[PDB]
Design a binder for these strands. Sequence first.
RNA 1: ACUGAAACUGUAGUAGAACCAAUCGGGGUCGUCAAUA
Length: 88
Amino acid sequence: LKGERGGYVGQFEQEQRNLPNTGKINSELFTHNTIQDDVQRPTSDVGGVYSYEAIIAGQTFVAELRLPDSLVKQITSKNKNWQAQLKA
RNA sequence: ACUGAAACUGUAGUAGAACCAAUCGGGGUCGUCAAUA
């Protein structure tokens, strides 16, 4: 057997009788350069180019803000629609 | 217990070399035609 490592699993319950659904995040490598301005070209491949992995667009993620009732009462007293302000 | 910043995948390189749209040909010249009764 090989141990599992990466990825994410969906919900599961004691008698589900199906494996949990897996989720995968699509990443791509992006490559960029700096131009040396006098020669107007990159100064070498080794120190002229750089790369970023990024999570690509169109993917959906869920976070949770957790706040105690103490602060939620304060926030709701100042703005009843405050959850509308979380859209950004 | 708090998102790093900032950085042009650019720089040089002629889709080109070679190949005949060509070879042969007098603008010429003479015997009939038709099938029945």
